[model samples]
Target: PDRATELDRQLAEVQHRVKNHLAMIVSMIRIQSSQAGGVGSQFDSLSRRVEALQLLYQEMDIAGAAKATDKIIPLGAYLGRIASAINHIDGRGAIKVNVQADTVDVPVETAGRIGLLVSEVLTNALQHAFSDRASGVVQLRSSVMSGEQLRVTVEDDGRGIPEDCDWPNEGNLGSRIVRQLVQGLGAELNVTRGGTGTIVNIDIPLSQQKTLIADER
Candidate 1:
């Protein structure tokens, strides 16, 4: 308990420092943009890049809950919050994101990575898939597999990717992040695009998945 408490404190201190660095950087960028004058879209893009990092920083606080046990996170509730936040931030009300996740728990480490991964995919769907239209629907669903694995699927009913173009361009930043997260989680990601829409399925092994009953909490 003593060692872990010390470690947690140290981790939190580092997080505070990093967050301050980001805050300062964002402040400088805005100040510089204002001084330079009339770089409207560039300023927006620069701020957006920082916002993405802020999102990542927010998700990295894996030690927030479950300190005593193996640090389990409720998958359904976590994913629901993530989807809702993404919808609010990027959906702009025209895009609808629906989430239906099972009542399963996973280690906090896995949950954090999964949250970031799902965010990227869902953001991609919102950003690219619905360009030509004003309204679209993206479904985020997850189901547990015999307590040994988890299956997550994100489906978008928008313009689909072409058959000739490779699905996830390696050079793309989002795709690179997706690949890194999948490798980190030791998971499998499959993307299928047709004339109608696109479907992405990620299979993750849950060697330490848990199911909490009324008493377990």
Candidate 2:
């Protein structure tokens, strides 16, 4: 009973946090709607943003359910679930999303930020890439190195970002959000685009992860 009670408690706490997130997203929609022309025009793009947050909510407390208020959340499985959920965004099978990661458990806060960042990048890919109905792929890969850092790769074989303007401009809300989130994490982000496709890689350093690795007892 104690364990079950803890699980319920954890879920409630996360739900509360996510409610604030819901409010933020709604506010963005309301403010961006005018710039977006109308609700009908920007509905799908905004929906992708909502979908990203939904994944955030899922991963935030999902770990707490199976164990104490903290369950084992391997990056492999977590990223896989996000990929699955985001792939369904374009229900007509326009693009395929895949996640490849080994067994690395990220801290809850780190996982939450990483999840949102990936979703933003991916949501942008699905919404803008492949405008001419060209079929392509979006792939996510992760690796742990130096015992305290993880490198993530998000690549897509699509039309690629426009070369005329800077990669992320003010007009592109998703790109701007991704850029700001990366800065907030103090993480490193790289972007490369040519005639072939666009590739985005992010390097995130885990907090005190070394101490957690060796059980030090």
Candidate 3:
């Protein structure tokens, strides 16, 4: 029993250290990319990877805090950060990121899941939706649809998801990760194709979200 407990503690410590180191690496890459001249595809990919890692760090931070309680991070702030990061990499500074949310906060777990979802959606938009031409916009909307029901949507004005593209059979790493995350959260995912662009909507129940509030007298 003692050995098992010690091993578990060591594993946790190792994980924490690794996460911190990864976060630092991401920060360094961001700085170096900013200073480098002549933006290229490799730099863009690096920025996207950095955004993904940033989302992971955010999730880890929230999970570490309020271990038993649910915490909420503002939807607007999270989306703004992702949009800014992507725009910075594009070097065009033409894409606009719009966010509309009824509430300022959501449960930490929900925020983390939503963060990754938004990152993937935005990354897809930047990589595929927007052609060599810049100057498009991505819109994000979030609201409490009903009692304990939450709805979040990510839409872009760029080229829509291809009609020939197989939605169910898309097996890329991003698509797979998105599918796993949505399923893990027990949420409903809807992909809608439009003349202008594509919209991905997600609905989840907040009742299942962990609530972290301080005790009062």
Candidate 4:
């Protein structure tokens, strides 16, 4: 029906606009920092985060826009894209990142934030893990549990997180943002360091997304 086509067109258009806006913001940030001093690590970090955000919008294109009225997109394909980018951007040819995600449709906003969290987690592993070794593996997995909750896990085979490191409360900007995003999504966060490597788990409910369920004022 033309109605379906029209809806798809409109959804795609909105996604396109969001993607462009995010791209524009990144460009503006780059220009703003061009003449400024001390723009090395800060700029890189911020830009990487923005890049992940933009990627999510792009992923929300036709693939996940097939059949949904509430901007629900597939999480597996979306996070898979982010996984590859993180591997390419930070892997440095020495670390290998692998992703296996279930085909689950989630709100676009939720997917975007989840992508960001995955990015930070993968980046952390690539940045901190395997420091003493020449290579390692990081595994990212996601699945829908009992059709009610989404569970995402990031595991790395490298030097485990130090016993004294306060993962949830203390860290750099990325860790803090991860914590904040988890809270924003009303998700659960669990980090465990094993004798071999570290595993980070995030669980989010699929129903009753507060913002999406609210009636428009």
Candidate 4 runs further than 4 Å off: 1-43, 60-71, 210-217
lDDT (CA) for every model shown?
0.62, 0.60, 0.59, 0.68
Model 1 scores a TM of 0.66
Writing each residue's lDDT as its tens digit, candidate 2 over 23-64 gives 354446434434554334334565455444445456654655
Q: What is the lDDT of residue 164 in candidate 3?
A: 84
Clashes of each: 0, 0, 3, 0
lDDT minimum window of 10 residues, candidate 1:
208-217
Candidate 3 C-alpha lDDT tens digits along 1-217: 2333443343343233332222243345445444542243254454465455455456445545444234446655666666567656653467776767665565544555566667777677767777855678777787787677788788878788878875534847567557755754568898888658888888977666552111210
TM-score of 2: 0.68
Residue 39 miss distance in model 2 (angstroms): 11
Colliding residue pairs in candidate 3: 70-211, 70-212, 71-108
Query: Which candidate do you rate higher for lDDT, 3 or 4?
Result: 4
Q: Which of candidates 1 and 4 is the stronger one according to TM-score?
A: 4
TM-score of each: 0.66, 0.68, 0.66, 0.74
After TM-score superposition, the amount by which residue 91's alpha carbon in candidate 4 deviates from its true location, in angstroms, is 0.9
lDDT of 4 by residue, 43-140 (tens): 45664664565566566656554432264677788788888877777777667787899997776656766877888888888888887878788999
Ranked by lDDT, the better of candidates 2 and 4 is: 4
Candidate 3: worst-modelled 10 consecutive residues by lDDT: 14-23
Instruction: For candidate 1, write residues 24-109 as lDDT tens digits.
Output: 43345445444544334233333333333344334445536443235356767777777776677677667888889998666544
lDDT of 3 at 56: 44
